[model samples]
Target: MIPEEIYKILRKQRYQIDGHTAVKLCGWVRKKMLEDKNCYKSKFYGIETHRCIQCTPSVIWCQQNSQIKEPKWEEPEVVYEKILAMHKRIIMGYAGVLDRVGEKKFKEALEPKHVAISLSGEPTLYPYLDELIKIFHKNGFTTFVVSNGILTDVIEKIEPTQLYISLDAYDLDSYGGKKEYWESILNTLDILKEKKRTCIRTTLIRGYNDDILKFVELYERADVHFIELKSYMDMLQHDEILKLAKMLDENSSYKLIDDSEDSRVALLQNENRKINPKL
Candidate 1:
């Protein structure tokens, strides 16, 4: 069970689904309902803000914490039903303002088609992740999972619609973990190639891990399709994302395919691989 202290903090923004799982209603969902606006994910990828549930199956656990006990896992069927119901409950608030949000959108909002398994924590820590993903797919919901790339063995066995491995540090010392932890992240770069759709997401912090060449080297080594350069929240601007993308474009074989200034992120795709998924 999540400690009461942490639970209260999370409850302010997240709806608890179980002891370890929680779901947050994306702001864009409300924006889309009232203003007809979409999130960058809707623009970059084909995900619809109105049709996605941003959630985490391991809200209080991650690779960063030490000696953590395994969480009480929720059954896949129970998780699936709860998340679907929670998403509907969240969007039901907009249903009353149908005249303003539009009848069609309010109807669509009730049926979320995508599940972003990355609202908080390192989701790979959730033991029943593979089963949960399978259940989501069986219900015709697309899954997008984000991880810190510390559990290569778990990652290798589970396949989501798209897998995002976040890289924050340029080197092992910068990562501040033992050598094995750093190597596991590097090993994941190789493993991603075999997956359906893979992306390396780097959060740029100037004068820190914002080395362009180091990011370029990762892109070169990893056989994935796309690398997203994003700014750390409140640490940078959209311009920084573009600048990084431009530098990477000039130094590497990647092309700046798309970007969302409002989201403060850019997408660089390897010319050799398919950038867009079949969705």
Candidate 2:
């Protein structure tokens, strides 16, 4: 019923035998959904991620109708067996999963050129973020953690080799609506500045958070090494949202980059004047 379950079914069937088949199947599904008038209602499905209550039904229908015979869903006992097998694989010298590696082995593995800690959601929300960073550093790895800047104190404790905070908007109202907590974000920014190894990433959405001056103010206050101002992307699942937002033109993003450069120059001048009376 879950996407993971459906994915496993597809995987078992070898429906994804090649990239071409996978792409074609996905495209056909999207096209069929679009053409079906009864299913074309906006309320029935989400624009981004296409997740709805119908997710399970859709998976079941696909499995039942498709030429490939569906594999039996793994029960709880089977899952446990699989986990045990995975643990055995790990104990036998697998290096992929986090659970298998003990502290000493993980430490030895951290002697690489660089290490990055990131995931689909906020990494700062992870309970062991600070400990993880400390361990990585203890093991001689320069650690970088990507966070959403919601938890300032936890972020401060990590003291990572590099910190990347994502800021999708210039103002709190635009960032996370009226309930947006700017104070905590400000504190995070201050921490980043104080720590001096943090970078801000701004994903620019057209007509959403395109206030250049406010962004400049943010940059001035934070004063980090890099500001990655990227354009909004229209992912397949979120076509409706993308259509509403209307992705910015390449030139529009270029203008922001140019403005940011000018802002940086002004900031440098201001800094020079404050430090040097001759200026």
Candidate 3:
């Protein structure tokens, strides 16, 4: 369940525009309010709960042709400015509850621990992406980015603490022309290999792309830091304490370590998980 604390923060702000609801604290923030726990990110990147800021313009901001749209493409200057403004308002609102809820955590939430640019919109589409990342780093926030990898050029230049390229298919059969889709993903992986800290995330659809070996081959090819294989979910339609795992053997795969069930979603990672070394 999402703690009243998390809602308290979100309830304090509204930074929505068009269809994507940008700017949010991580889902783990709610769990921190209820149970003192660390996100899987701790093992991979050493980020603490209080130190992370999870914000995105909604996945709709992606530059992909069919799924996203960026009407405000011309107003590059104020895009991130708005995100920060909304974030500050909520943090301050949460402070009111902190005195009684948990003073230590209240203070921690305000500190700039890290910035997660995983929210709506293909973040790379923002013309000022490099500048946006620079400001966060300047403020002492470790950075992490998740992208669809369409704009491979800008993505290669980003220096997040860790980076992720979400892949829809391990093959070109469904995504598009084999050479076009396949080569783009391969080239993106190649860039990640030589420069950035990278991971490959596959949304494991039951009938679609349940093949684990395909994902393994792709990750190993990039020599990425880790692989995040997840189950497919339609958040608007279903809501429950659902858990799914893919195995590395009969003994292990991934299990729900934490979740925000009110959101009808949760976090899962490999059973034999280990540290994701810094690049």
Error of 3 at 211 (Å): 1.0
Under the 3 Å rule for N, CA and C atoms, how many clashes does model 2 have? 2
| Model 1 misplaced regions, further than 4 Å | 14-17, 65-68
- Inter-residue clash pairs, candidate 1: none
Q: TM-scores for all candidates?
A: 0.94, 0.46, 0.72
Q: What is the lDDT of residue 53 in candidate 1?
A: 93
lDDT tens per residue, model 2, 219-275: 667766544444445322233323222222111211111112211110111221122
> Which candidate number would show the highest lDDT if scored against the true structure?
1
Q: What lDDT tens digits, residue by residue, belong to model 3 across residues 1-279?
A: 233554455456543332233676666666765577766565445677656777764434444433223545434336556666666666776766665548777777766577788765577777667777777777777778888787778887878777878876776664633456466667887777665456666665555665555555555566665555455563221122233323422224444344443333334443444433432
Tens digits of per-residue lDDT, candidate 1, 141-247, equal 88899998988988998889889988877677777467888799888878888888888888888688677677677787776888888888748788878987998
lDDT (Cα) of model 3: 0.59
Q: Each candidate's lDDT (Cα)?
A: 0.81, 0.42, 0.59
For each candidate, how many residue pairs have backbone atoms clashing (under 3 Å)?
Answer: 0, 2, 11
What is candidate 1's local distance difference test score? Answer: 0.81
TM-score of 2: 0.46
